[PDB]
Motif scaffolding. Sequence first.
Motif: not given
Length: 1935
Positions: A1787-1810
């Motif tokens: 939860g608490d998914r902001h626009l900074d904790n959710v990224l996107i790989d521009m090459t392969t199109g996949e989606v990565v996530h930053i560490d989940y403190n909550v």
Amino acid sequence: SADPDNLKYSNSAVVSRQRHDDTHADIQNDEKGGYSVNGGSGENTYGRKSLGQELRVNNVTSPEFTSVQHGSRALATKDMRKSQERSMSYSDESRLSNLLRRITREDDRDRRLATVKQLKEFIQQPENKLVLVKQLDNILAAVHDVLNESSKLLQELRQEGACCLGLLCASLSYEAEKIFKWIFSKFSSSAKDEVKLLYLCATYKALETVGEKKAFSSVMQLVMTSLQSILENVDTPELLCKCVKCILLVARCYPHIFSTNFRDTVDILVGWHIDHTQKPSLTQQVSGWLQSLEPFWVADLAFSTTLLGQFLEDMEAYAEDLSHVASGESVDEDVPPPSVSLPKLAALLRVFSTVVRSIGERFSPIRGPPITEAYVTDVLYRVMRCVTAANQVFFSEAVLTAANECVGVLLGSLDPSMTIHCDMVITYGLDQLENCQTCGTDYIISVLNLLTLIVEQINTVVAVAHAVYQAVLSLKNIPVLETAYKLILGEMTCALNNLLHSAFKNHVFNVDNAKFVVIFDLSALTTIGNAKNSLIGMWALSPTVFALLSKNLMIVHSDLAVHFPAIQYAVLYTLYSHCTRHDHNLLGILLKKDNLNQDTRKLLMTWALEAAVLMKKSETYAPLFKFCKGLLANTLVEDVNVCRVQLVHSGTRIRQAFGKLLKSIPLDVVLSNNNHTEIQEISLALRSHMSKAPSNTFHPQDFSDVISFILYGNSHRTGKDNWLERLFYSCQRLDKRDQSTIPRNLLKTDAVLWQWAIWEAAQFTVLSKLRTPLGRAQDTFQTIEGIIRSDEGHGNNQLRLVLLLQYLENLEKLMYNAYEGCAPKVIRTFFYTNRQTCQDWLTRIRLSIMRVGLLAGQPAVTVRHGFDLLEVTIMMVVEALCELHCPEAIQGIAVWSSSIVGKNLLWINSVAQQAEGRFEKASVEYQEHLCAMTGVDCCISSVINYLGNKACECYISIADWAAVQEWQNAIHDLKKPDPRELQKSIEVQLLRSSVCLATALNPIEQDQKWQSITENVVKYLKQTSRIAIGPLRLSTLTVSQSLPVLSTLQLYCSSALENTVSNRLSTALRYTMYQNQLLEKIKEQTVPIRSHLMELGLTAAKFARKRGNVSLATRLLAQCSEVQLGKTTTAQDLVQHFKKLSTQGQVDEKWGPELDIEKTKLLYTAGQSTHAMEMLSSCAISFCKSVKAEYAVAKSILTLAKWIQAEWKEIPRIESESTVHIGVGEPDFILGQLYHLSSVQAAKSWAALASWAYRWGRKVVDNASQGEGVRLLPREKSEVQNLLPDTITEEEKERIYGILGQAVEDDMVDVIWRQLISSCTEGVIKVWRKVVDRIFSLYKLSCSAYFTFLKLNAGMIVMATLRLLRLLVKHAGELRQYLEHGLETTPTAPWRGIIPQLFSRLNHPEVYVRQSICNLLCRVAQDSPHLILYPAIVGTISMQDCYSKIVDKLSSANPTMVLQVQMLVAELRRVTVLWDELWLGVLLQQHMYVLRRIQQLEDEVKRVEKHTALMKPIVFALEHVRSITAAEKWFQDNYGDAIENALEKLKTPLSWIPFKEIMLSLQQRAQKRASYILRLEEISPWLAAMTNTEIALPGEVVTIHSVGGTITILPTKTKPKKLLFLGSSYPYLFKGLEDLHLDERIMQFLSIVNTMFATINRQETPRFHARHYSVTPLGTRSGLIQWVDGATPLFGLYKRWQQREAALQAQKIVPRPSELYYSKIGPARRDWPLHVMKAVLEELMEATPPNLLAKELWSSCTTPDEWWRVTQSYARSTAVMSMVGYIIGLGDRHLDNVLIDMTTGEVVHIDYNVCFEKGKSLRVPEKVPFRMTQNIETALGVTGVEGVFRLSCEQVLHIMRRGRETLLTLLEAFVYDPLVDWTNSYAVSVWKRVKAKLEGRDVDPNRRMSVAEQVDYVIKEATNLDNLAQLYEGWTAWV
């Protein structure tokens, strides 16, 4: 006669004498009278007149003796005499008697002149001297040839002209030793006396030349050891007599001609070494060193038995001085080392070669300090301290290497030396790295090793050598260097791999062959030399080799356009490499990255006029202005003031297409007329081309003669499509575009005022004009035209048809089946086709015709067995797709087409495609020719005018590349020099059949498609089976191929077509492989049922027709060899039709391999237990009861099942007793017996038994703990032993025992109730009966442990590992005899990776359970320690008896490598935080604590220790923060300890005034700079010192080589420190004051989730993959994680949009992300707006465009196919990361904790403190989203969210999770209840919530929701406007 002689007495009158003398006696004296008085012009002419006629007897020889008047006048008369003597040959006068003495007297006068006469007197004298034997003239002629010629003043050529004269005449008279004696006597006489003068140099050396001449012919006399005495007498007059330093040229070469006559008999070496060692006195002279170095070789020739010691020690600093610019002896000094190397006396080699190697190893350390390398890797070095310090090292290495060549020369049948072969590898670490920077010694060593390995290459005396070459051929192949080494490397490899096959098990090395083939994967593309690629594609064409082929496919896929002869090599490679692996990548990503980087620079160089030629080739048919000129046009630019070194070929085509558009973007286009005309010219090039598909017209776009111009017509369409795509990319300068380009360009003067979207909306015919050649070229425009018009009947038929042509994306086609809300049922069945079940989906297409037409099924469609797996007048034509589905393999239409003739009889129109192609095929080779003649065949009667040139449009070549193969195949049967006319028509067909695989690289595509690559392999098969009768490969081979979907057409349906014809002609081994082409087509599955019976009829026996009676046709039929795999497929085929008739056949086929060796018996039972698993059978218990009670009932299935399991006594030690049977539990009991019977013999058969045994063991021991249970055998013992008193009390004693024994210190309680009732010794029976009653109760778990052990021994393993770990620590009392004996004895072993949970279980509360865990950890540390590192080093800093016993065993091997990582961990813990300025954080919590003392300060002084002593608690920290800092390592006491003493001078001993100064003086440093931290020279400078280390595994599963670059302060959050590692590049970052232990369990759970998708990740083109996050804890509140891969945040494209909007408004930041929500919520506490948030949210969603991310992945993809792959991978990765996020805690998914790989199109996530549902504990405006479904993620799919492609992939995740739910619940049970995580009433609630979410009992704990229902419930709540409006302002729900 007399007249010519008188006329002779003018130059033209004497030439007639030659003719007059041939036809006399008066012409004899005329030569003497005339030639002796004339000049020089008429002197030599007279001597050739009477040279052969007459007479040379009495008058032609006598007057010549009296010619002493002059020398020159007699020179012409003395030679003619011997000329006549040679010409007459009577012989009357030729070497005659004393009359010849005159000539001898003339020899006395030759010494008076310059010996010019002897040039013609002595060359003809001995030739006429046989026989005529004369030898007395040698002693008369040698008196002036060596005595008078001593000082005759050069007198140079005469000495060499006189030595050859002493051969012919001196050959005879072998008794010439008197000459030697008389010469040596006078020589010694002149040597003895008297002193150094000029008399002892002229006549002293010349006599020595006699020894050089007279010894020439004398080689046969005699000899009896006289030459030894001769040498003894000759040596002395030169040793002690000079002493003068004269010339010794003739003196040193005197023994050369003498000592060479003896070889090994005897010598005087004791007096010869000093004769050879003293002469080399440096340095004179240049011409004197030759005859001084030659005697060394002369002596070494005779030194083979008697030689040792100092004779070889004189080569240190004596003869090496001749290794300089003096070139006259540079080659004469390189002969002795070879002459002493091979021969002889190998004992002397141990000195000579060792000295040579010491000199070689003593020159490299001299070059050390110039480069500061290691010192010095010396093994064969000796004490020789020479400091060259110049360029002489290169020469000293080259000469030594050239001299050491003779050691590796045939034969050399002895190796007592230091294995010079291994010398090239023992030093290969130093002189082969830098060495860069040398740079030729590596080249010389490679040449030496090649010359050594050419004579012998491979034999398997040494055996590791044959395996050490490749091991050193890979480490030296790709450390990229100058091209002077690859030319030899690729030649050595090509010579080695040829002999490898021509042995035999060397391919399974395995570490050598698996590495020798990786270097070819890199050397095949770089660099561009056109000479190494041919030495790699051919060097790899012969090997396969054993394992890896996908890399070769990725290479050849990008190597078929080089425009060089390498294209043919790559084609020949891919045509015979392998099949079904293409169709199974790496190099395609390189092309993608090279294309995505050229568009960012935006250079404006070309072209003003040259760009107008790139459009004429695409739009029109004009040629290139010439040749291809691609490289020329690319090199014309740059021209500066980028692409890699490949430059071929798509990298240039895409670049030219992008440049011709960067030039076209400006308004005034130069290539064409003005914009309003260029737009019309582009629109007319497609409006007159898209209508061509539903018509038949001609134009220069398709009709282009000749080849290659028809196959180049698809390239024009592809180029135009890419041109339009990149134009739409570049025409987005009005939004404007994102950070790809600048915006795009300045371009804000016309692109904003004018709008080109009105033309793109009115010119969307590209959906038809670009759907023929390319698939994904129509979806880009269809998803933009269908989304803005919110006709619909025509614009939608061109969408589902395109998605069908992809052969994939069938899940995305169901979106339109749920998209009918926007103003039908046809899409619901049009998506059920791929879905590769062409047999099905035929009824639903015909069902969609009623009641708009007729029935459309002529005899039937067999619908009953097929479900167990508006008048628009336009959709009816689309139904023609039926002919593309059913007919192409199942033709049928022979009647069904007639059903259209009636259907078209009432309406109009209903058209179809051609019918000759279906009438020609198949199974007939006579009517096929007549059916093919009617088309466009223009066949050949047994290039470049082949089948057709008009029209032959795009994508129709597939229909044209299959009609040609039918011609040359019918000719093979009509015929069988004859097939010579066919190979010239097929080999050219491969040139036009490979154009579909060449256009698959424009601009960038994947292995698609596969329907046209089969026509290439099957054509290579035809061209291979035409030159011969097909005796071997190709066949072709099409075996598994676990693809697995890979629709049979045209993969298998087009492969068995020609393969059946290849077997139908028998006029090799084409009958066994043919069954493999059918058995792999019968198992379809899923789910072609009509196309699965023809192969069954062609395999065993033919069947006419069956309407559903297949069971009566193929059932209970036994066969023999070959393999019976065709039996288990008929039963599975009957499963899809019948239920009870298939299991009977299965169990019947089980009783077949009862007496056999095939392992198929492990597949039938394991494949039948699923059929008999559920649910209506319920007869196994009745069958077992009948077997126990004289079975006579009921069915045959039960009888067979009971007769197949009864074989356990004829074939996991003991089977069921059975005490675990119905007596206690398990009422079925038959499935377990089948699983136990399926144990034979050895991989997936033990897991199925373990999953049952462990389940029924855990489902009984928990039930027996509440109740009780006892069998008769364990209860009769207590009844027979407790005699006499009574058994009534035993009746309850047995119940007490059954209750207490199953309740599992604990065992002792078993006696507590024993003496409570009986109260009577007999104390051992109470401990034996209480464990025998619990033996069989705990026996179902022992069988499970044994099964898991046997499964781990034979190679999901994580499931068994977790079950064993949960069974060991639950109750170690049983089975202790099986766990302790199996876990410590090779369990798997070990079971790395992802499960290290043993570390969490080492601190267990029971003894003897950690003794095995410690042993297993020692084993996993001793074997493959790189799998897990830093295991206990972190734990040892912060159970305690186990970390030491692990770390000591880990440090036993390579203690330096563990000490280095220990110091690294210490430094990483010391750099954190630092807490120097963090002390203010302790003072930051003094809002009301320290102020209360102030309330006392103004209280004590007013009433007149309690106040000063109240702050004593802060003093304990104020002193602690100063005590911990006591030694920027040297500057920490000046920058940190600056005023620390002056700040506590009054606060510590006592308003707390000196408290804010330290907090304010340090806060100003943070606002000064961003990264206010120095380099690695900081407080921890050890990182900058460890410039090299071994393998350390920096938090991965190798590259920790030297050091990272620098660290950053990261002012965004607190407190990250991003740093690199630059391993052999890897960014990491530290985290302090944060417990990073649960974040590791989260990543472990993610990895366990990802390893369960691998079973279904097989095409599966959008592969299921959750992005991991490599983390590692560095102690409590300390950790190290990875920073990021290539990926941009989602907030960047929003801040850039805000900036662009601000710049656009300024032409007429803030934004702010938190101040904007308050700018509109004003005009409306907690609060309760409430009800206003839902309205104000719509005011922001309608302001930002919903395509901020859709226009980003669209702009970041150059090709229209790469965009499709990116959009299909993004929708899969987002769904994966959202369904895992919905489960646990995300939860608490902001626009900074959710990224996107521009090459392969996949989606990565930053560490989940909550996490773990902690988002609902705030203490903040509450949010309840299950995922992120914002406005810019819902519009990212093709159409929407549901039921779009992103939904159908979410329903499979829940299916794969609920099927393996326990495997997750067992993980959390070990994740929670921790000892270091510190999450116990809270760790149980999270586990219960996870279990309820996995069991679908999320909201209602009384109803079991389905997977689709749960997905719909989670999607409806994540996108609801009510829940998305009550979120935090920082979540950015509007964006």
